[PDB]
Short mmCIF file of C-alpha atoms in Angstrom, two decimals:
data_model
loop_
_atom_site.label_atom_id
_atom_site.label_comp_id
_atom_site.label_asym_id
_atom_site.label_seq_id
_atom_site.Cartn_x
_atom_site.Cartn_y
_atom_site.Cartn_z
CA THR A 1 19.43 17.12 12.16
CA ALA A 2 20.65 14.72 14.99
CA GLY A 3 17.58 15.93 16.86
CA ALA A 4 15.09 15.43 13.98
CA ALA A 5 11.81 13.73 15.02
CA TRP A 6 10.61 12.87 11.47
CA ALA A 7 12.16 11.67 8.22
CA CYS A 8 10.58 12.84 4.95
CA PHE A 9 10.85 10.55 1.90
CA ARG A 10 10.09 11.67 -1.68
CA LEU A 11 8.33 8.60 -3.13
CA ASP A 12 9.38 8.65 -6.81
CA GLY A 13 7.76 5.16 -7.11
CA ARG A 14 4.25 6.66 -6.38
CA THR A 15 2.20 9.11 -8.45
CA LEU A 16 -1.23 10.75 -8.41
CA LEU A 17 -4.29 10.70 -10.69
CA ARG A 18 -7.25 13.08 -10.14
CA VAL A 19 -10.73 11.57 -10.75
CA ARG A 20 -13.58 14.16 -10.98
CA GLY A 21 -17.01 14.55 -12.51
CA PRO A 22 -20.54 13.86 -11.30
CA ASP A 23 -20.31 10.03 -11.73
CA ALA A 24 -16.72 9.82 -10.13
CA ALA A 25 -17.97 8.20 -6.89
CA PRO A 26 -20.18 5.33 -8.27
CA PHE A 27 -17.59 4.81 -11.07
CA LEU A 28 -14.69 4.28 -8.62
CA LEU A 29 -16.87 2.33 -6.14
CA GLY A 30 -17.50 -0.33 -8.80
CA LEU A 31 -13.75 -0.81 -9.46
CA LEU A 32 -12.22 -0.69 -5.92
CA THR A 33 -12.37 -3.04 -2.93
CA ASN A 34 -13.29 -0.30 -0.42
CA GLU A 35 -15.62 2.64 0.31
CA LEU A 36 -14.25 6.03 -0.83
CA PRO A 37 -12.72 8.47 1.69
CA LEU A 38 -15.24 11.27 2.01
CA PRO A 39 -14.74 13.93 4.69
CA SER A 40 -17.75 14.32 7.09
CA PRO A 41 -20.33 17.07 6.28
CA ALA A 42 -18.58 20.47 6.86
CA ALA A 43 -19.46 22.85 9.76
CA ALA A 44 -20.19 26.59 9.13
CA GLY A 45 -16.55 27.78 9.78
CA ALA A 46 -15.60 25.30 7.03
CA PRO A 47 -11.84 24.56 7.79
CA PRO A 48 -10.66 22.27 4.89
CA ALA A 49 -10.51 18.57 5.71
CA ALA A 50 -9.11 15.56 3.87
CA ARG A 51 -9.76 11.84 4.28
CA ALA A 52 -7.51 8.98 3.13
CA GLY A 53 -8.33 5.33 2.52
CA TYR A 54 -6.70 2.24 1.16
CA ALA A 55 -7.99 -0.11 -1.55
CA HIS A 56 -6.96 -2.39 -4.38
CA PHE A 57 -8.19 -2.46 -7.98
CA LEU A 58 -8.80 -6.20 -8.67
CA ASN A 59 -9.32 -8.06 -11.98
CA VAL A 60 -12.46 -10.23 -12.59
CA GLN A 61 -10.38 -13.28 -11.49
CA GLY A 62 -10.11 -11.66 -8.02
CA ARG A 63 -6.38 -10.89 -8.18
CA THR A 64 -4.85 -7.54 -7.24
CA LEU A 65 -3.99 -5.28 -10.20
CA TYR A 66 -3.02 -2.02 -8.38
CA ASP A 67 -2.62 -0.92 -4.74
CA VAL A 68 -3.89 2.63 -4.25
CA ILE A 69 -4.20 5.24 -1.52
CA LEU A 70 -7.34 7.34 -2.05
CA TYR A 71 -7.63 10.96 -0.89
CA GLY A 72 -10.83 13.02 -0.67
CA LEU A 73 -10.44 16.86 0.06
CA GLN A 74 -13.35 18.99 1.28
CA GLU A 75 -13.04 22.84 0.80
CA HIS A 76 -16.31 24.74 -0.05
CA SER A 77 -18.39 22.37 2.15
CA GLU A 78 -18.17 20.03 -0.95
CA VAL A 79 -15.66 17.46 -2.38
CA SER A 80 -14.04 18.19 -5.83
CA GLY A 81 -13.37 14.47 -6.65
CA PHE A 82 -10.60 12.12 -5.52
CA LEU A 83 -6.83 11.64 -5.79
CA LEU A 84 -5.56 8.09 -6.53
CA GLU A 85 -2.00 7.33 -5.48
CA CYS A 86 -0.67 4.41 -7.54
CA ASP A 87 2.71 2.89 -8.45
CA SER A 88 4.40 5.24 -10.99
CA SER A 89 5.26 2.28 -13.29
CA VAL A 90 1.54 1.39 -13.77
CA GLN A 91 0.08 4.93 -14.00
CA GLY A 92 -0.51 4.47 -17.79
CA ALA A 93 -2.07 0.99 -17.38
CA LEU A 94 -4.34 2.27 -14.53
CA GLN A 95 -5.51 5.15 -16.78
CA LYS A 96 -6.28 2.57 -19.56
CA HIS A 97 -8.17 0.38 -16.98
CA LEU A 98 -10.32 3.32 -15.83
CA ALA A 99 -10.95 4.28 -19.53
CA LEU A 100 -12.22 0.68 -20.30
CA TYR A 101 -14.99 1.14 -17.69
CA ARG A 102 -15.47 4.96 -18.09
CA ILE A 103 -17.45 4.52 -21.41
CA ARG A 104 -20.46 6.93 -21.27
CA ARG A 105 -19.87 8.02 -17.62
CA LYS A 106 -19.49 11.68 -16.46
CA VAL A 107 -15.90 11.14 -15.16
CA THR A 108 -12.56 12.80 -15.97
CA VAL A 109 -9.27 10.98 -15.18
CA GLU A 110 -6.06 13.04 -15.39
CA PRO A 111 -2.48 12.88 -14.06
CA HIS A 112 -2.05 15.26 -11.11
CA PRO A 113 1.61 16.40 -11.32
CA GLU A 114 0.63 19.50 -9.12
CA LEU A 115 1.38 17.37 -5.99
CA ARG A 116 4.30 14.96 -5.36
CA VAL A 117 3.94 12.02 -2.96
CA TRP A 118 5.98 11.97 0.27
CA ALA A 119 5.97 9.77 3.33
CA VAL A 120 6.81 11.03 6.83
CA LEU A 121 8.07 8.41 9.33
CA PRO A 122 9.21 8.80 12.92
CA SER A 123 13.00 8.93 13.55
CA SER A 124 12.26 6.76 16.74
CA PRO A 125 10.02 3.65 17.12
CA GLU A 126 7.58 4.60 19.99
CA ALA A 127 9.94 7.43 21.12
CA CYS A 128 6.94 9.76 21.76
CA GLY A 129 9.54 12.43 22.64
CA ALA A 130 7.37 15.26 21.19
CA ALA A 131 6.43 16.74 17.75
CA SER A 132 3.07 14.98 17.29
CA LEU A 133 1.89 16.21 13.80
CA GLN A 134 -1.41 17.80 12.87
CA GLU A 135 -3.47 16.88 9.80
CA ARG A 136 -3.32 19.66 7.13
CA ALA A 137 -5.59 19.95 4.10
CA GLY A 138 -5.31 22.43 1.20
CA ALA A 139 -4.91 22.32 -2.60
CA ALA A 140 -1.10 22.93 -2.11
CA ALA A 141 -0.53 20.35 0.74
CA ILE A 142 -2.32 17.43 2.36
CA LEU A 143 -0.70 15.84 5.47
CA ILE A 144 -2.71 12.84 6.57
CA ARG A 145 -2.18 9.61 8.51
CA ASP A 146 -1.39 6.57 6.36
CA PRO A 147 -4.68 4.66 6.12
CA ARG A 148 -3.06 1.20 6.10
CA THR A 149 -1.53 1.31 9.60
CA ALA A 150 -0.17 3.87 12.04
CA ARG A 151 3.15 2.00 11.54
CA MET A 152 3.40 3.81 8.15
CA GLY A 153 3.34 7.32 9.66
CA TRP A 154 1.96 10.09 7.45
CA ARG A 155 1.41 10.72 3.78
CA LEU A 156 2.32 14.20 2.55
CA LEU A 157 1.13 15.40 -0.86
CA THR A 158 2.90 18.70 -1.61
CA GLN A 159 4.25 21.03 -4.30
CA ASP A 160 7.38 21.90 -2.21
CA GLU A 161 10.07 20.22 -0.04
CA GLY A 162 8.87 17.82 2.69
CA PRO A 163 10.70 19.24 5.75
CA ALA A 164 9.36 22.84 5.05
CA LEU A 165 5.89 21.71 6.49
CA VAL A 166 7.00 19.15 9.14
CA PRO A 167 8.47 20.55 12.39
CA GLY A 168 11.53 18.50 13.34
CA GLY A 169 11.53 16.93 9.85
CA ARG A 170 14.73 16.02 7.90
CA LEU A 171 15.05 14.56 4.40
CA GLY A 172 15.29 10.77 4.55
CA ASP A 173 17.17 8.22 2.44
CA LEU A 174 14.57 6.29 0.32
CA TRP A 175 16.37 3.04 1.27
CA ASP A 176 15.22 3.53 4.90
CA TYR A 177 11.57 3.98 3.83
CA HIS A 178 11.59 0.64 1.99
CA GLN A 179 13.61 -1.01 4.83
CA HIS A 180 10.88 0.16 7.23
CA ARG A 181 8.11 -1.24 5.03
CA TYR A 182 9.81 -4.65 4.79
CA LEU A 183 10.57 -4.79 8.55
CA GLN A 184 6.90 -3.91 9.19
CA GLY A 185 5.49 -6.33 6.54
CA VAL A 186 3.80 -3.56 4.50
CA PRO A 187 3.49 -4.41 0.80
CA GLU A 188 3.51 -1.50 -1.67
CA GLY A 189 3.84 -1.42 -5.44
CA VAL A 190 4.20 -3.89 -8.33
CA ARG A 191 7.17 -5.94 -7.03
CA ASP A 192 5.42 -6.73 -3.70
CA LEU A 193 2.01 -7.00 -5.45
CA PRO A 194 2.49 -8.42 -8.95
CA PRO A 195 -0.50 -7.32 -11.05
CA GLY A 196 -2.79 -10.28 -11.75
CA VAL A 197 -0.83 -12.61 -9.49
CA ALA A 198 -1.07 -11.22 -5.95
CA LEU A 199 -4.33 -12.19 -4.19
CA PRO A 200 -5.79 -9.36 -2.06
CA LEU A 201 -6.57 -11.18 1.20
CA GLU A 202 -3.25 -13.06 1.05
CA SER A 203 -1.70 -9.56 0.61
CA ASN A 204 -3.27 -8.64 4.04
CA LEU A 205 -5.78 -6.20 2.45
CA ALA A 206 -8.27 -6.79 5.34
CA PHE A 207 -5.51 -6.13 7.93
CA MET A 208 -4.67 -2.80 6.17
CA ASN A 209 -8.21 -1.25 6.13
CA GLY A 210 -8.47 -1.93 2.37
CA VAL A 211 -11.68 -3.95 1.84
CA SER A 212 -15.35 -3.52 2.70
CA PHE A 213 -17.76 -6.51 3.00
CA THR A 214 -20.78 -4.13 3.28
CA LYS A 215 -20.25 -2.03 0.14
CA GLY A 216 -22.01 -2.57 -3.20
CA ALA A 217 -20.69 -4.55 -6.15
CA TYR A 218 -17.13 -4.21 -7.38
CA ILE A 219 -14.84 -6.07 -9.78
CA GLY A 220 -13.47 -9.14 -7.99
CA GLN A 221 -15.92 -8.96 -5.04
CA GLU A 222 -17.44 -12.43 -5.58
CA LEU A 223 -14.11 -14.34 -5.06
CA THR A 224 -12.90 -11.90 -2.39
CA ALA A 225 -16.05 -12.29 -0.25
CA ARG A 226 -16.11 -16.08 -0.78
CA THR A 227 -12.47 -16.37 0.34
CA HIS A 228 -13.10 -14.14 3.38
CA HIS A 229 -16.10 -16.05 4.65
CA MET A 230 -15.08 -19.62 3.85
CA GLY A 231 -12.35 -19.68 6.53
CA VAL A 232 -8.83 -18.69 7.72
CA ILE A 233 -6.57 -17.24 4.91
CA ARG A 234 -4.08 -20.12 4.44
CA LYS A 235 -1.27 -18.05 2.84
CA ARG A 236 -0.16 -14.45 3.63
CA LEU A 237 2.68 -12.06 2.93
CA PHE A 238 4.98 -12.07 6.00
CA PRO A 239 8.13 -10.00 6.69
CA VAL A 240 11.31 -12.05 6.35
CA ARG A 241 14.95 -11.36 7.28
CA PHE A 242 17.88 -13.29 5.67
CA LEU A 243 20.32 -14.64 8.31
CA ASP A 244 23.21 -15.67 5.93
CA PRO A 245 25.17 -13.49 3.43
CA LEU A 246 23.22 -13.26 0.16
CA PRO A 247 24.37 -13.91 -3.43
CA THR A 248 25.46 -10.87 -5.58
CA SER A 249 22.08 -10.73 -7.49
CA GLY A 250 20.11 -11.30 -4.22
CA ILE A 251 17.17 -13.74 -3.89
CA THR A 252 15.10 -14.19 -7.12
CA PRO A 253 11.33 -13.44 -6.75
CA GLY A 254 9.59 -16.78 -6.59
CA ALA A 255 12.44 -18.55 -4.79
CA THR A 256 10.95 -21.45 -2.80
CA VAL A 257 11.00 -21.16 1.01
CA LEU A 258 11.75 -24.59 2.52
CA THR A 259 11.76 -26.40 5.93
CA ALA A 260 14.85 -28.27 7.20
CA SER A 261 13.27 -31.40 5.56
CA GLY A 262 12.76 -29.69 2.16
CA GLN A 263 8.91 -29.10 2.45
CA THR A 264 7.74 -26.01 0.37
CA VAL A 265 6.02 -23.54 2.75
CA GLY A 266 5.97 -20.59 0.33
CA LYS A 267 7.86 -18.31 -2.04
CA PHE A 268 9.94 -15.15 -1.66
CA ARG A 269 8.05 -12.16 -3.12
CA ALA A 270 10.32 -9.04 -3.00
CA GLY A 271 12.64 -7.10 -0.77
CA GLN A 272 15.67 -4.86 -0.31
CA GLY A 273 18.97 -5.71 1.35
CA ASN A 274 18.61 -8.44 4.04
CA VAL A 275 14.77 -8.04 4.40
CA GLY A 276 11.69 -8.64 2.33
CA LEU A 277 8.28 -10.28 2.10
CA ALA A 278 7.47 -13.95 1.41
CA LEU A 279 4.09 -15.51 0.66
CA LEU A 280 4.02 -18.28 3.30
CA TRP A 281 1.59 -20.88 4.64
CA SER A 282 0.60 -19.18 7.98
CA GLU A 283 0.73 -22.45 10.05
CA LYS A 284 4.40 -23.13 8.89
CA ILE A 285 6.36 -19.87 9.56
CA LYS A 286 7.83 -21.29 12.89
CA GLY A 287 10.46 -24.06 12.12
CA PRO A 288 13.87 -23.01 10.65
CA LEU A 289 13.44 -22.01 7.03
CA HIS A 290 15.84 -21.48 4.07
CA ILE A 291 16.07 -20.77 0.31
CA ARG A 292 18.26 -22.93 -1.93
CA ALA A 293 21.15 -20.95 -3.50
CA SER A 294 23.78 -22.18 -6.09
CA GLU A 295 25.46 -24.15 -3.19
CA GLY A 296 22.99 -26.07 -0.96
CA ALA A 297 24.23 -24.64 2.43
CA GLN A 298 22.49 -21.15 2.95
CA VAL A 299 20.36 -19.19 2.82
CA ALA A 300 18.55 -19.18 6.26
CA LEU A 301 15.66 -16.75 6.83
CA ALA A 302 13.32 -15.93 9.68
CA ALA A 303 9.67 -14.95 9.24
CA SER A 304 7.66 -13.01 11.82
CA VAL A 305 4.16 -11.70 12.53
CA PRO A 306 3.82 -7.86 12.32
CA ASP A 307 2.86 -6.26 15.71
CA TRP A 308 0.10 -4.17 14.04
CA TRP A 309 -1.88 -7.10 12.54
CA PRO A 310 -5.09 -7.97 14.47
#
């Protein structure tokens, strides 16, 4: 597969819930930061269509609880509810969260093991050789562009093996998927987004098509809207690369990111290998930075601005 155009990653860290019932839409709208992804009204010849969107579930304090990708699938000129793609490790907690609010509402929430979550990323950055993909929508497979950024390729929800639907697709090593996210500054899951600690706008939610300022009320809206409108977001998650060999255990989440003069300009969040994310003061990412290790020499790191941010 030296000539593969696409790498297909089985995302064991992500899982699906199906939310259905007559009140599913208003119910989810009150809990999420975004509009729901509803396919456009269907034409006579009714070829199935799916829509994806990004959102967070926030707490009443305005902090991120869960990052989710939302999928709406249209088949008989109607939508049969939504799929919620969440971190596997919080699937139980997210069910309990939905149950707390689902009191007396016509809504069903169930695990959807029928589809497994895959990502499909280009083998080449901007190669544009060939093998543009086409959206697919059916109960057995949905292939749809990542709603956060085109830098994240395609999501594939399927019963079967990834490459069997993607021309020029090969199986990918999960390490490379996470490497890609950290190089591109894309947070995903509970290590990047600690529930009740990560703040949505500092997590670049508005750069990732994940928040609406026109939608009706939702949990955590008041603080989110206030933060958005009161000025520039002072701290954000940025991609970082370590420039010095790391310690055996790596960098501890929360490790302070310092200037040459020892000023705190943020904290390491999470990563893999020599790359990761750090929550940094946006005006201070420029001068050489470091983290203190056991011996106060290393560890140098460089922060950068993702090319897909606005």
